[PDB]
Chain length 211, copies 4
Amino acid sequence: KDIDTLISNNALWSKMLVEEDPGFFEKLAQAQKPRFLWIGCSDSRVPAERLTGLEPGELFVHRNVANLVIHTDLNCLSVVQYAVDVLEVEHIIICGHYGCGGVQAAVENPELGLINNWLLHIRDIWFKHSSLLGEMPQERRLDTLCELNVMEQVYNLGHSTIMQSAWKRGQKVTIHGWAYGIHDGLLRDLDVTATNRETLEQRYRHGISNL
Amino acid sequence: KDIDTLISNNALWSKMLVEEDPGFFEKLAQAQKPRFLWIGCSDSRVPAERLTGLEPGELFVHRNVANLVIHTDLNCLSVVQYAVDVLEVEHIIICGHYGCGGVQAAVENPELGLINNWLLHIRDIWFKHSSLLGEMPQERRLDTLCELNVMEQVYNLGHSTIMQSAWKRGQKVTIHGWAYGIHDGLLRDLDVTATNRETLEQRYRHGISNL
Amino acid sequence: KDIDTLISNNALWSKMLVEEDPGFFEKLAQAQKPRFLWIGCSDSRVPAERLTGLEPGELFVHRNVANLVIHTDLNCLSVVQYAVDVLEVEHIIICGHYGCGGVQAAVENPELGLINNWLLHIRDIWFKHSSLLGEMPQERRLDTLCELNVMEQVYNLGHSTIMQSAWKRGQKVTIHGWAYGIHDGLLRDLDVTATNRETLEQRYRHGISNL
Amino acid sequence: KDIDTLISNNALWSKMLVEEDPGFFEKLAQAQKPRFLWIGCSDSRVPAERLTGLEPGELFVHRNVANLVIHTDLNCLSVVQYAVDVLEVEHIIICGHYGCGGVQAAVENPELGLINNWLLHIRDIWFKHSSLLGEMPQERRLDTLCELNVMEQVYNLGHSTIMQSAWKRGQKVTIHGWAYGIHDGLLRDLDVTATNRETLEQRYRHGISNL
Ligand SMILES: [K+]
Ligand SMILES: [K+]
Ligand SMILES: [K+]
Ligand SMILES: [K+]
Ligand SMILES: [Zn+2]
Ligand SMILES: [Zn+2]
Ligand SMILES: [Zn+2]
Ligand SMILES: [Zn+2]
């Protein structure tokens, strides 16, 4: 697939929509404010819309390398503050995936250039849960770090002033930590679901305990 | 659609893949390095995979509010450096969309909170092309700013040290500036396609001239 | 001067304070909240305390390359929000200096590495005021860009949600744009002093007009 | 001291330099590339030039809240890459101070606004060394966290691709971790001095062991 193939496929796909689903854009034209924010990885192995079946206009999406919510990443923070304060999304979903190239690159630690600084945040998590990973077989360490990474980004998101203020105001915002593999595409709930400051700390320790 | 509906739909979708497309994950398991990087908006009105027909594993995706490539956004820069130096993508596509909430919020300029700082970069572009927008009817100003925004992010991307170094090394990397509307989902090529430092400056002025 | 010389000089300087100024730290121990925030360049050719005579504890200081206030630099924005909302500084001073290495590196544009991305914000200003610099002799272009850079960072600071909210609340916060040279160390007021949203836009055009 | 007092003091100070030290700017005009980079706190309780006696032109300075070197702070990283690759500084000094308002605000954790996100990096350190602080008296916990913060920023700086590449190339660059108090202004060497990748990890554990 070259560039010309993508452009030509888009034109043919747009024209065939008149027969298949002429109302494909009606919910978009009606300004359907999305109820979900998806924070995923730039790998995008299986698209979030394909995993969940969410139709166009229902999903706000941010994607960075290894789905991180850094404390001081104004890029991701701006997406969250916009989705929470303006769009008023009711659910935020952070979703990693097993075999993530960013998580793996943080462990193997090769000289990849500028991205290594970004990956240092994963190694902080990989260092933080060193005692937890030791009680586990070696073959399961990398997939668990992928889950631990999601749990920590959920933790970081809930600790941000954006979520602290929204929960203080009383907004119904729920944070979710998910993961999937390319062996079945089955979403796994890491069970760190947070609705307020108390459930955030409660379910974080619950997710760490289940591992 | 609640949270339980997305989880249950994912399970049923994963099981039905055995009959519909049991090889749905074969290209993913074979570690297909993506040839395309998509820098789009977090609005994600129509997903990039739906617009272009790209199958899972073929598209590296970064999404922020109003598809920006800020000079000093290490989030977006890390995605680019990883896609260019490690994954060695052959095409980078920056794609806006008409009626973008971020572009519109920058023009109307309401008090939306933290996101207004992020949107100040659009107002810089909206200020930069003030004389160009004046020669146009009022009803076409906002859609053109959406196109100008894409052209400037392509300009910024090509000016980054990541792209300057890759083009200096001789890597075949091409930057594209696209836009689409939710009235047909038809991708429009803004014709600022850059393959090196010279075509970057050449096609930037060509895109500005066509407007 | 090696490392041992700095450590030994500090010890001797600390001991000699008992005779010279035993109350050197009394204002510091009394928790003197600083009334001034200084946003200067990392070059720090002449220290701000030496230029203004401000004693220890009176100056909050942020320094980056070429004294920038990028719209989305959470580092500088965090210093400002802390100084304005918590410390409640009454004056913010952005001060460049003629012959700044960062301003010069942006114009000459050498391959310096990661810093070139940071310097792209200066080239945006150098592009923005292209018509203004043309009406001037060549020998004065670089020093004027140093002044234009300060005026634009003052403009950016006043446009940030931190300053917009503080001025909306009624806080007495004043932004200043200064510059100095190493030929005399004399501070030059660029006359873009802003106390609210109206004087910000008014004095910005006044500073551009004086050039 | 108002604004007029600072401007007038600067003018009088500049004029009196002709009699006191007419060569005050000679080392500045001779383009003395600084050999030291100082990463300090924006509190700037005692200026670095006053602590060490470094004359103008000898010190490259970056200052943020609680002297942090975040993995993905392109502001601080740009200052470092410029000082190391372009200026080729031979020493980088990270210096905290006891009673730092940022360190204290991270522990007490009040609702201060945007700065709380920046301070979450300190709470990560305060969480990381929880077992170390427990073996110590309560009255010494906060001053030790100030030291631990410096040791971790030195650790982060040495882990950045900027320092990893400079040490790989063979550049003589040394990282130092210092701290001082406003009770005497005496600089304390935290003894985490790093000259390469090996001494970085060695002296980090040595500094943690001394506590
Ligand atoms: K993914
Ligand atoms: K979109
Ligand atoms: K300076
Ligand atoms: K300090
Ligand atoms: Zn991934
Ligand atoms: Zn949009
Ligand atoms: Zn400078
Ligand atoms: Zn401090």
